[PDB]
């Protein structure tokens, strides 16, 4: 709250105007966008308020858990950005990741959001490459035997 | 790759490193699970096989 | 350095008291993290403080 006062030349007090109001930045995510790739995951947030001064902090990990206050311990972290691209070999196409996203500004935190993301489920668009290509070269003795 | 911090006050010194690539094997190619056909092929193969 | 005094009504200058420091930002990198991949390095140095 904030007491505004007017004070003549002696400055004897008047009476008193006050305004109270109050100030955080939450600012839990609205949505979450996840874009598969080769071995990647593009993790994209989004709010319902945008404000130009939150960045929004990732954790990964492999399997669910049932508590949400060990994330700290369970998790681990990999970056504070805008976005983020989950990039890595370990991973393989069809195993379900979780990201738990929160915001971060100056003040400071957010609640938890959960997402769940997978890599690309093979279809066809990682085919049209090799048209005439492949040659003998990169078989090994199985072409040599079988020929 | 030379790496340095760089901030508004100043500069700092340079830290070197040395990467090289991934070279995982039957695991990476996981993807390609029997989908090349006869379009992906090669010519010698084609005529030979 | 910073030099602070006290000052009476007229302004006659008290014993002055002295305090010293200094301000840097080095912020060497402590280790280096590499993450090798598919045709990739990614790069996510760190530094200890």
Redesign the interface.
Known sequence: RLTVRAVNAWGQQGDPASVSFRIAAPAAPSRIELTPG??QITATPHLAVYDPTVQFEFWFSEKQIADIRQVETSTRYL?TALYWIA???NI??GHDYYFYIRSVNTVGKSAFVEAVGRASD?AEG??DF???????SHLGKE?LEK?
């Open positions: 080769y071995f970056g990039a890595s070999i393989k196409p093979d990682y085919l090799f048209k005439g290509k492949i040659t003998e072409l020929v």
